[PDB]
Amino acid sequence: DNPGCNEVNSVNCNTSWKIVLFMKWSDNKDDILKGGDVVRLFHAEQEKF
Amino acid sequence: EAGNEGSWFYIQPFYKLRSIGDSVVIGDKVVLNPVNAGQPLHASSHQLV
């Protein structure tokens, strides 16, 4: 279906999954901006752009 | 001098950023209207003699 697309299986072969972080715990509070939030930029007066 | 009744002034925001219940910041633009006149106090353009 896709050109660059390797599937993931589960056998005895060896691999290394590097745990690379994105956002710390206690940064997932719902009342602050984060680095992955989806927002809409409403103008204070007229309308969203 | 004596403080006539009718010198009461509602403080009402001119910009749409702020609303009723929000504390006023220093340096913003505000419009002033009396409590029982309903006519916002403005500066005219009719010069005096």
Swiss-Prot record, chain A:
Signal peptide: none annotated. It comes from the Eukaryota. Coiled coil: none annotated. It is found in: Endoplasmic reticulum membrane; Cytoplasmic vesicle, Secretory vesicle membrane; Cytoplasm, Perinuclear region. Polyubiquitinated. Polyubiquitination targets ITPR1 for proteasomal degradation. Approximately 40% of the ITPR1-associated ubiquitin is monoubiquitin, and polyubiquitins are both 'Lys-48'- and 'Lys-63'-linked. Homotetramer. Homodimer. Interacts with ERP44 in a pH-, redox state- and calcium-dependent manner which results in the inhibition the calcium channel activity. The strength of this interaction inversely correlates with calcium concentration. Part of cGMP kinase signaling complex at least composed of ACTA2/alpha-actin, CNN1/calponin H1, PLN/phospholamban, PRKG1 and ITPR1. Interacts with IRAG1. Interacts with CABP1 (via N-terminus). Interacts with TESPA1. Inositol 1,4,5-trisphosphate-gated calcium channel that, upon inositol 1,4,5-trisphosphate binding, mediates calcium release from the endoplasmic reticulum (ER). Undergoes conformational changes upon ligand binding, suggesting structural flexibility that allows the channel to switch from a closed state, capable of interacting with its ligands such as 1,4,5-trisphosphate and calcium, to an open state, capable of transferring calcium ions across the ER membrane. Cytoplasmic calcium released from the ER triggers apoptosis by the activation of CAMK2 complex. Belongs to the InsP3 receptor family. The ITPR1 structure has a large solenoid CY assembly built around the central helical bundle made of the C-terminal domains from four ITPR1 subunits. The solenoid scaffold includes domains responsible for binding of ligands and regulatory proteins and is connected via an allosteric nexus at the cytosolic-membrane interface to the transmembrane channel assembly. Six transmembrane helices from each subunit form the central ion-conduction pore. This is Inositol 1,4,5-trisphosphate-gated calcium channel ITPR1. The lineage of its organism: Eukaryota, Metazoa, Chordata, Craniata, Vertebrata. The chain holds residues 202 to 250 of 2750 of the full protein.
Swiss-Prot record, chain B:
It is found in: Endoplasmic reticulum membrane; Cytoplasmic vesicle, Secretory vesicle membrane; Cytoplasm, Perinuclear region. It comes from the Eukaryota. Polyubiquitinated. Polyubiquitination targets ITPR1 for proteasomal degradation. Approximately 40% of the ITPR1-associated ubiquitin is monoubiquitin, and polyubiquitins are both 'Lys-48'- and 'Lys-63'-linked. Coiled coil: none annotated. Belongs to the InsP3 receptor family. Homotetramer. Homodimer. Interacts with ERP44 in a pH-, redox state- and calcium-dependent manner which results in the inhibition the calcium channel activity. The strength of this interaction inversely correlates with calcium concentration. Part of cGMP kinase signaling complex at least composed of ACTA2/alpha-actin, CNN1/calponin H1, PLN/phospholamban, PRKG1 and ITPR1. Interacts with IRAG1. Interacts with CABP1 (via N-terminus). Interacts with TESPA1. Inositol 1,4,5-trisphosphate-gated calcium channel that, upon inositol 1,4,5-trisphosphate binding, mediates calcium release from the endoplasmic reticulum (ER). Undergoes conformational changes upon ligand binding, suggesting structural flexibility that allows the channel to switch from a closed state, capable of interacting with its ligands such as 1,4,5-trisphosphate and calcium, to an open state, capable of transferring calcium ions across the ER membrane. Cytoplasmic calcium released from the ER triggers apoptosis by the activation of CAMK2 complex. The ITPR1 structure has a large solenoid CY assembly built around the central helical bundle made of the C-terminal domains from four ITPR1 subunits. The solenoid scaffold includes domains responsible for binding of ligands and regulatory proteins and is connected via an allosteric nexus at the cytosolic-membrane interface to the transmembrane channel assembly. Six transmembrane helices from each subunit form the central ion-conduction pore. This is Inositol 1,4,5-trisphosphate-gated calcium channel ITPR1. The chain holds residues 153 to 201 of 2750 of the full protein.
